[PDB]
Design a protein around this ligand. Structure first.
Ligand SMILES: [Zn+2]
Length: 214
């Protein structure tokens, strides 16, 4: 069931590596401009003053954040990002939460890691948001995985990977780290388009299982 790293093109690997190592993080910005019916526009708010277009799965979502002070944390990209002006538009799916919703205290989540069934050091990620997007937690975990296990380097020994985010109830979410939508970010990141958010204090822990080349 777990997809193999060898299934991905070089473009897909370079793109994955790029976004999990350089996420777009912006705090307290507001947009009173919808594009299409489900994209919010933050002119000149992206990298290099490029414009920023945050895409949502529904107009329901875009409206919810329209004219709200929001925090952004997601995987950004340019290719296929619909321009709003004659200037370069930078894109990102979901990764949006209200800036007013901060925890009374920093939530640290433990991430157990296994490589071929052998327990490695438990890793840590944290957030100060009451409702954190799954995208944010995922990027934070993949960053550590990229740093320590070189998950997105073509010639590293890791070839299969599963990340499990467990709640305090029997609810869990998971990502096969190599089952990418396609090779371009506009495809790959639709994985975050629903802006799925989790109640930070209800998260139990993360379980990561990687398997070496075979
Ligand atoms: Zn566990």
């Amino acid at each position: 069931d777990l997809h193999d790293k060898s299934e991905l093109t070089d473009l897909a690997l370079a793109n994955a590596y790029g976004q999990y190592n350089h996420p777009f993080i912006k705090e307290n910005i507001k947009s009173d401009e919808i594009s299409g019916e489900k994209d919010l526009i933050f002119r000149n708010q992206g990298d290099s003053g490029n414009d920023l277009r945050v895409k949502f799965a529904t107009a329901d979502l875009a409206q919810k954040f329209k004219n709200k002070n929001v925090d952004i944390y997601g995987a950004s990209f340019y290719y296929k990002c619909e321009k709003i002006s004659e200037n370069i538009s930078e894109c990102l799916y979901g990764g949006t939460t209200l800036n007013s919703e901060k925890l009374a205290q920093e939530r640290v989540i433990g991430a157990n890691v296994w490589v071929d069934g052998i327990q490695k050091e438990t890793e840590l990620i944290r957030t100060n948001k009451k409702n954190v997007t799954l995208q944010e937690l995922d990027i934070k975990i993949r960053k550590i995985l990229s740093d320590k296990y070189k998950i997105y380097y073509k010639d590293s020994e890791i070839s299969k990977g599963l990340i499990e985010f467990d709640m305090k109830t029997p609810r869990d979410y998971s990502f096969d780290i190599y089952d990418l939508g396609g090779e371009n970010d506009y495809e790959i990141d639709k994985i975050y388009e629903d802006n799925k958010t989790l109640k930070s204090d209800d998260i139990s822990h993360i379980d990561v299982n990687l398997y070496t080349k075979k």
